[PDB]
């Protein structure tokens, strides 16, 4: 694996596995991180995955510095842009590969 | 495919295709960009792939800004650090995947 | 100056100076790279500057690899994502500075 | 303000502000982040700022993931290469500009 994927996995385990363990979605059926769901929901481009991660979507909190208002955003520390870039890259790679173990 | 692999492919097709088209090595045997040869030669980490690309190695010219001496380095445009970073990522990932078309 | 500014300037002097010398606009009045024009045209943020540079806007050619269609895009080589990032950074910096 | 300076400010306010608030230096005289001191100490290029941040210097710990030896490096969380790049950019810019606000 590459350094970017390794870092992506580390960030994912820190920030995302509460709701998306093994690529799933414990809150919203049909909105997993697998390719078919990403496509159905219009979040299949890496750019859109970044946007969803930064700003949030529906009941998902955004993680970006400038996510707003605070109720739409993570209770925890905001992630840096580069971290969100790596997370979007990780989700795109994982979806392309059918979610190999992280 | 991720954006990073697309970006790396663009760079690879410009800078590396002279000797390493399709992951091979036209100059000498046993030094392709396939896993077995990277492992054989001890150039199997992104850090080392970066180093070889930056500074050169034997009959391979270096592409880094501070590649020296001149004789060991490309006489074309030198690549930026981020470009070589992308190239190291590209080679590592492509080696892992057995060099599929991008 | 920083490495990013230096690289941004190098890229600008190759790809942009023809139409935007000293932050101006040789084709379109009211659409210079100065702060007030950028704001008036809704190209206020660095993210929007990147979008415009990548995809183009009318007689402004797009420089990104996926700019489309061809007639909307530079006739020269497409610029890399990182290059367009540096260009948006350069233009934002220069606009903030008032193009000295 | 550019995105990069904002990203650098965020990192600075987490890792550096405790000793270098306002571009100063609380530990010892004559080693602030102002141009005059950077030039005097030979830490005036962006590359040298990066190196000092990564590896440390005198009483300053290094923050790089691969900083050595152990005693010259932070015992707290280490920074990623991209974070140190943004920090070096931030310091170089702020020094060039005479440490204006934000
Ligand atoms: C961790 C930083 C994190 C990432 C990365 C992430 C990504 C992500 C994507 C790409 C989607 C779109 C899925 C689709 O099929 O359309 C998505 C959607 C939802 N998420 Fe998420 N998500 C991360 C973090 C979290 C956390 C910690 C939670 C739980 C609190 C969470 C929840 C959700 C929910 C709900 C959705 C569905 C949104 C909708 O379309 O209604 N996410 N996430
Ligand atoms: C393009 C910038 C480029 C990259 C990237 C690249 C990578 C690379 C690697 C990772 C190796 C190690 C391979 C191994 O099995 O050990 C490697 C090695 C050699 N290369 Fe290369 N290389 C790039 C560019 C070029 C070009 C343009 C040439 C031809 C002039 C070239 C040639 C070689 C040679 C020879 C080696 C073997 C070096 C040695 O072990 O002595 N490379 N390259
Ligand atoms: C070089 C890569 C380049 C950059 C960078 C760039 C930027 C840019 C911006 C940010 C705008 C918006 C300005 C505003 O006030 O709204 C803008 C607009 C126009 N440009 Fe441009 N541009 C670059 C390259 C070029 C080149 C080479 C030309 C000339 C062929 C050109 C022209 C124009 C035109 C016309 C506009 C106005 C678009 C509109 O609002 O109708 N640009 N550019
Ligand atoms: C935050 C990660 C951080 C940065 C960035 C940073 C930079 C930095 C530079 C560029 C210098 C050179 C200054 C000069 O005038 O030559 C420098 C020097 C020192 N610093 Fe630093 N530094 C960061 C973090 C910290 C922290 C958290 C402390 C306090 C524990 C600290 C202290 C020092 C000291 C002491 C020096 C002087 C080194 C020397 O020349 O002997 N730094 N720093
Ligand atoms: Zn990557
Ligand atoms: Zn920058």
From Swiss-Prot, chain C:
One BP term from GO: photosynthesis
Recorded superkingdom: Eukaryota
GO cellular component: chloroplast thylakoid lumen
Any further remark recorded for this protein: Cyt c6 and plastocyanin are functionally equivalent.
Post-translational modification note: Binds 1 heme c group covalently per subunit.
Keyword Disulfide bond: no
Binding site for heme: 28-32
Main location: plastid
Range covered out of full length: 71 to 170 of 175
Keyword annotations: Chloroplast, Electron transport, Heme, Iron, Metal-binding, Photosynthesis, Plastid, Thylakoid, Transit peptide, Transport
Subunit and partners: Monomer. Interacts in vitro with LTO1.
The protein's name: Cytochrome c6, chloroplastic
Family: Belongs to the cytochrome c family. PetJ subfamily.
Function as written in the Swiss-Prot or TrEMBL entry: Functions as an electron carrier between membrane-bound cytochrome b6-f and photosystem I in oxygenic photosynthesis.
Organism taxonomic ancestry: Eukaryota, Viridiplantae, Streptophyta, Embryophyta, Tracheophyta
Record-level Gene Ontology MF annotations: electron transfer activity; heme binding; iron ion binding
Residues involved in heme c binding: 16, 19-20, 60
Subcellular location: Plastid, Chloroplast thylakoid lumen
């Amino acid at each position: 694996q590459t350094l970017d994927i390794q870092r992506g996995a580390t960030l994912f385990n820190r920030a995302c596995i509460g709701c998306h363990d093994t690529g799933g979605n414990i809150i919203q059926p049909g909105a997993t991180l697998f390719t078919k769901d990403l496509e159905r929901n219009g979040v299949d481009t890496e750019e859109e995955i970044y946007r969803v991660t930064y700003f949030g979507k529906g009941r998902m909190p955004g993680f970006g510095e400038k996510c707003t208002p605070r109720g739409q955003c993570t209770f925890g520390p905001r992630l840096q842009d580069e971290e969100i870039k790596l997370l979007a890259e990780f989700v795109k790679f994982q979806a392309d590969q059918g979610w190999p173990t992280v």
